[PDB]
Design a protein around this ligand. Structure first.
Ligand code: SF4
Ligand SMILES: [Zn+2]
Ligand SMILES: [Zn+2]
Lengths: 149, 714
C-alpha cells in the first residue's frame, strides 16, 4: 500500500490504502475502483495495453512488484508438476536438478514463449501423472494438516 | 613476591595480596585442575586481571600440555588496551626473575577500523566502510590483478605480508594495538592479519566478545585449534545481552528499501557481467555444484548443496521473492506479531519458498557476490543483513521469535516499521564456546547471584565463588536512602514517578549531597524521559539553581558527540575545584563505557531502580521464554536485570588503589531483602542494617563523616 497510486486514477490510494493490487496475465497493477472502470468498457481489457482477458483475469494479490506477481502465480501452477519429494531421488546431484529445472521453467514462462514449455509439460504428464503426481497430491493435505497442528 | 599456592608456586609482581586474592587463585586453580567451566566474581577491577593472569602463567608453565592458549576477552577495546599493560608488566617481572627470554607471546586483536596503516582507510571511521575498502584491496581479483602488476592501487602491506608474514612468525613479545600498528609500519605488514596469524602460536590472545560469540566472525578466528584453552571473559555480567544481540537481526523499512535499490544494482551488475564476462565467471556455477560469513554455528551450519538457487538470475529472483514477502509482511498494520516457526511456514506457503534452499541463501549470496567483482560490500551491507536474517529464520526457530512492530513506540504513527528477530536465550550462541573449549571462566564484577547464570546459560559450573575485598581501610561506604526529610516513600515506581514529592526528594538529596561531596559526582536515572521530567521539575523549582550554585551540573543525551564533549568537560571540572554533577541513565551507553576513579564520581547516586519499559514486546518475548523454560519467575529475572545493572554502573567508584568512594541508592526498594540478596557480595556485606534506611539528611551527615575518616592519610 506504499505505492504512489494507480497509473491512471491515483486518487483512491491517497484517500485510503484499503485497495489491493489485482493480478492479471499482463502482470499489471490494477485497483478495485479502476477495475470497475475496466468492466464497463471492454470487460476484461487492460486500459493502456489492451491485453484481452477471458473473464477479467482478476485475483487478489498484495505484492506491489508486478513481475513477482506473475512469478508467484506461475510458480503455483508449476508446483503442481515435479512435486515429488527429495527422498524419491537417490542420487545426490539430481536432488536439486529438478528444482533447478523447475526454476528454469518458471523463468521461461514469465518471459520466454511457453509453447516449448507447454509441450515439455505434456511429456512429463504422460509419465508422472500415473504415480508420482497423484501420490503427492493426496499426501499434500496430510502433511499440511499435521504441520499446522 | 612469589606465592607458594597449594597447587604450585605462582609468581606475583606486586608487593602484597589481600586474603581474598589467596582465595581467588586457589578457587581458579580448582576449576582449572578440574578442567571444567566455572564462574566467579572478584570486586577489584584492577589487580583482578593480574591475579587471574598470574595463575595462568604459572599454570601454563606447570602444565603446558593441559592448557594450549589463554583467551582473555574484555568488553571494550579501550578497556582491553589497559589489560595488556598489566600483562606486559607481569611478563617483565616474570622475565626479570628468570633473567632470559621465554617462549611467551601476547597480543590483542581488533577490527581493521580500529587499527590499520593503509592511508585510504585511515580517514574513514565507519566500521562497515573500512571492511569494504580492505575487502576490495585484498579481493582475489585485485590479488590476481596484482600479479599482472597493472596500473591500479594495490595494498602493498598485505601483498608483502603473505610472502613474509607466512614464512616468519614473530618469536615473542607484547604488542598493544598502538604498538602493534607501529610494528606493521616498520615491517610493512598488516597489524590486523599479522595478529591473526599469530593466533596459531600465541600463549595469550585477547579480544572483545564480538570476536568470540557471533559465529559469523568468531568461529573462523576461533577455530578448533584451541582444543583445550583457558577462555576467560572479564566484567561479563551482561554477557547474555551481548551474546543475544549477536544473534538478533533487525529488518526495517529503510533497510528493506535500501535492499530493493541494492538488489536493483545487483541486477544491473549481473547484466554488465553477462555481456562482458560470462564463461570465466560461469565456472563458479560448477564450483557451486561441486561444493561476511554465515551466522550458523559449527553444528547448525550446513553446506550440503546450494539447492535450487544456482544462478544469479535464479538466485536474484529468490531474494526478490523473499524481499517482497518481508516487505508485505512488514507493511501490515496491526498489533505486534510473534511467529517464530510460523513465519517460515507462512513464507514457504505464501511465495513457495522451501526452507532448505533458503538456508544456503546467505552463503550463496557471498559466493555469488564474490563472482560479481563488486566495488565494495558497504553499499550492499543491508542486503547481506537481510540474507543473514533470511538464513537464520530458515535454519531454526526453537529458541527464537520473529517480532514485527508496524508502529514504533514513542510515536503515534511512524512510516518506518522495524521487524525484530530478537532471540530469547543466550545459551544457543554461546553453546559452541563451552563445547569447543574445555573450561571457560566467566570472571566479572558487580555480579548478581551466580546460580542464575547456569539457568540463563546452559552449563554446569564447577564452582560458585563470591569474593569480598578485604582491606585495612573500609574504602566503600554504601547506603540506601528510601526515606527523605518528609519520611515519604521515595520509590521511583511507575505509578509513583509522577509524585512531586518523590521528584523533590531526589533534588533535595542531590542538593544536600552536592554540598558535602567533593569534586566529582555522578547521578544515574532510570530512563532519559524520566530524567528530563526530573530535570524539568528541578529546573522549574529553585532546587536546580541551588545545585548549580553548589556545583556544576551536566546532563547526558542520546547522541554520543554531546556525551563525549560533556564527559570531557566533566573530567575538567573535577581537576579544577568546580566539580561536576553528571546526570546519566543507567542503561545509557555512557555509563557502561565510562569508568570512575579517584576524585571522579566520588558519590555515585542511583536514583531509583533501573527498569526498562515493560511494554517493550521484545523484552516480553525474552522474559516470557525464561519463564517458559529454565524455571525463572518473570519478576525474579526483571529484578535480577535491574540489580545486576544497578550494581554494574555503581561499582566503578572502587576501581582500585583503595581510593575512597561512597555509593548511595536513592530508593527504598533496594533496602528490601530480595534486592540486597541480588546485590554483589562486596557491596552487600559491607552494607549494614543500621544505615540501610538512612534519611536524606541523615545519609548526608554520615557521608560527611565518612569523607573525614577517608580524608586523613594511612
Ligand atoms: S590489507 Fe592490511 S593494510 Fe591494507 S587495508 Fe586491509 S588491514 Fe589495512
Ligand atoms: Zn486505477
Ligand atoms: Zn497492462
Amino acid at each position: 500500500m506504499d505505492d504512489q497510486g494507480c497509473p491512471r486514477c491515483k486518487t483512491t490510494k491517497y484517500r485510503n490504502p484499503s485497495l489491493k493490487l489485482m493480478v492479471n496475465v499482463c502482470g499489471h497493477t490494477l485497483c478495485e475502483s479502476c477495475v470497475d472502470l475496466l468492466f464497463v468498457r471492454g470487460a476484461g481489457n487492460c486500459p493502456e495495453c489492451g491485453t484481452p482477458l477471458r473473464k477479467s483475469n482478476f485475483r487478489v494479490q498484495l505484492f506491489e512488484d508486478p513481475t513477482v506477481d506473475k512469478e508467484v502465480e506461475i510458480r503455483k501452477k508449476v508446483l503442481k508438476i515435479y512435486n515429488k519429494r527429495e527422498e524419491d531421488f537417490p542420487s545426490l546431484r539430481e536432488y536439486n536438478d529438478f528444482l533447478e529445472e523447475v526454476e528454469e521453467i518458471v523463468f521461461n514462462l514469465t518471459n520466454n514463449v511457453d509453447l516449448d514449455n507447454t509441450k515439455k509439460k505434456m511429456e512429463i504428464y504422460q509419465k508422472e501423472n500415473k504415480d508420482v503426481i497423484q501420490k503427492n497430491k493426496l499426501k499434500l493435505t496430510r502433511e499440511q494438516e499435521e504441520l499446522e497442528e | 613476591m612469589k606465592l607458594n599456592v597449594d597447587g604450585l608456586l605462582v609468581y606475583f609482581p606486586y608487593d602484597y595480596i589481600y586474603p581474598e586474592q589467596f582465595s581467588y587463585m586457589r578457587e581458579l586453580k580448582r576449576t582449572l585442575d578440574a578442567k571444567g567451566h566455572g564462574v566467579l566474581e572478584m570486586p577489584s577491577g584492577t589487580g583482578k586481571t593480574v591475579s587471574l593472569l598470574a595463575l595462568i602463567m604459572a599454570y601454563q608453565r606447570a602444565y603446558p600440555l593441559e592448557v594450549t592458549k589463554l583467551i582473555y576477552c574484555s568488553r571494550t577495546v579501550p578497556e582491553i588496551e589497559k589489560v595488556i599493560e598489566e600483562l606486559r608488566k607481569l611478563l617483565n617481572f616474570y622475565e626479570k626473575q628468570e633473567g632470559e627470554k621465554l617462549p611467551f607471546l601476547g597480543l590483542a586483536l581488533s577490527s581493521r577500523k580500529n587499527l590499520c596503516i593503509h592511508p585510504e582507510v585511515t580517514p574513514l571511521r565507519f566500521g562497515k566502510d573500512v571492511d569494504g575498502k580492505c575487502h576490495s584491496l585484498t579481493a582475489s581479483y585485485v590479488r590476481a590483478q596484482y600479479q599482472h602488476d597493472t596500473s591500479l592501487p594495490h595494498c602493498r602491506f598485505y601483498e608483502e605480508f603473505d610472502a613474509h608474514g607466512r614464512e616468519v612468525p614473530l618469536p615473542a613479545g607484547i604488542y598493544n594495538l598502538d604498538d602493534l600498528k607501529a610494528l606493521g609500519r616498520r615491517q610493512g605488514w598488516c597489524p590486523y592479519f599479522l595478529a591473526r596469524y599469530s593466533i596459531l602460536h600465541a600463549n595469550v590472545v585477547v579480544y572483545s566478545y564480538h570476536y568470540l560469540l557471533d559465529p559469523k566472525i568468531a568461529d573462523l578466528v576461533s577455530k578448533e585449534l584451541a582444543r583445550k584453552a583457558v577462555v576467560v571473559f572479564d566484567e561479563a555480567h551482561n554477557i547474555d545481552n551481548v551474546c543475544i544481540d549477536s544473534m538478533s537481526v533487525n529488518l526495517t523499512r529503510r533497510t528493506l528499501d535500501r535492499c530493493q535499490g541494492n538488489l536493483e544494482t545487483l541486477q544491473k551488475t549481473v547484466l554488465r557481467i553477462k555481456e562482458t564476462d560470462e564463461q570465466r565467471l560461469r565456472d563458479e556455477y560448477r564450483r557451486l555444484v561441486e561444493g561476511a560469513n554465515p551466522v550458523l554455528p559449527d553444528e547448525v551450519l550446513q553446506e550440503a548443496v546450494p539447492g535450487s538457487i544456482r544462478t544469479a538470475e535464479h538466485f536474484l529472483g529468490f531474494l526478490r521473492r523473499l524481499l517482497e514477502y518481508v516487505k508485505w509482511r512488514l507493511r501490515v498494520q496491526h498489533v505486534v506479531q510473534e511467529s517464530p516457526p510460523a513465519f517460515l511456514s507462512g513464507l514457504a506457503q505464501r511465495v513457495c519458498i522451501q526452507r532448505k534452499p533458503l538456508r544456503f541463501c546467505a552463503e550463496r549470496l557471498r559466493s555469488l557476490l564474490h563472482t560479481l567483482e563488486i566495488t565494495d560490500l558497504a553499499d550492499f551491507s543491508p542486503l547481506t543483513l537481510l540474507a543473514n536474517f533470511a538464513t537464520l529464520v530458515s535454519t531454526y526457530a526453537k529458541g527464537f521469535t520473529i517480532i514485527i512492530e508496524p508502529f514504533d513506540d514513542r510515536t503515534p504513527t511512524i512510516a518506518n516499521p522495524i521487524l525484530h528477530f530478537s532471540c530469547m536465550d543466550a545459551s544457543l550462541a554461546i553453546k559452541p564456546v563451552f563445547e569447543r573449549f574445555q573450561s571457560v571462566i566467566i570472571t566479572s564484577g558487580t555480579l548478581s547471584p551466580l546460580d542464575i547464570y547456569p539457568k540463563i546459560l546452559d552449563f554446569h559450573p564447577v564452582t560458585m565463588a563470591t569474593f569480598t575485598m578485604t582491606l585495612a581501610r573500609v574504602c566503600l561506604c554504601p547506603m540506601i536512602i528510601g526515606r527523605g526529610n518528609d519520611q515519604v516513600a521515595i520509590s521511583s515506581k511507575f505509578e509513583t514517578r509522577e509524585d512531586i514529592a518523590v521528584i523533590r526528594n531526589y533534588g533535595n538529596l542531590l542538593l544536600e549531597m552536592s554540598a558535602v561531596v567533593p569534586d566529582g559526582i555522578v547521578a544515574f536515572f532510570t530512563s532519559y524521559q524520566y530524567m528530563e521530567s526530573t530535570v524539568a521539575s528541578w529546573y522549574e523549582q529553585g532546587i536546580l539553581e541551588n545545585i548549580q550554585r553548589n556545583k556544576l551540573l551536566f546532563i547526558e543525551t542520546q547522541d554520543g558527540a554531546e556525551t563525549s564533549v560533556a564527559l570531557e568537560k566533566y573530567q575538567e571540572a573535577c581537576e579544577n575545584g568546580r566539580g561536576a554533577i553528571l546526570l546519566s541513565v543507567a542503561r545509557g551507553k555512557v555509563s557502561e563505557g565510562i569508568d570512575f576513579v579517584h576524585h571522579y564520581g566520588r558519590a555515585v547516586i542511583m536514583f531509583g531502580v533501573p527498569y526498562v519499559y515493560t511494554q517493550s514486546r521484545i523484552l516480553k518475548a525474552r522474559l516470557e521464554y525464561l519463564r517458559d523454560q529454565f524455571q525463572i519467575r518473570e519478576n525474579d529475572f526483571l529484578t535480577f536485570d535491574a540489580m545486576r545493572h544497578a550494581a554494574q554502573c555503581v561499582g566503578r567508584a572502587i576501581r582500585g588503589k583503595t581510593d575512597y568512594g561512597l555509593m548511595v541508592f536513592a530508593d527504598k526498594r533496594f533496602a528490601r531483602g530480595d534486592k540486597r540478596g541480588k546485590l554483589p557480595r562486596w557491596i552487600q556485606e559491607h552494607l549494614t542494617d543500621a544505615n540501610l534506611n538512612l534519611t536524606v539528611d541523615e545519609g548526608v551527615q554520615v557521608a560527611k563523616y565518612f569523607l573525614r575518616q577517608m580524608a586523613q592519610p594511612f
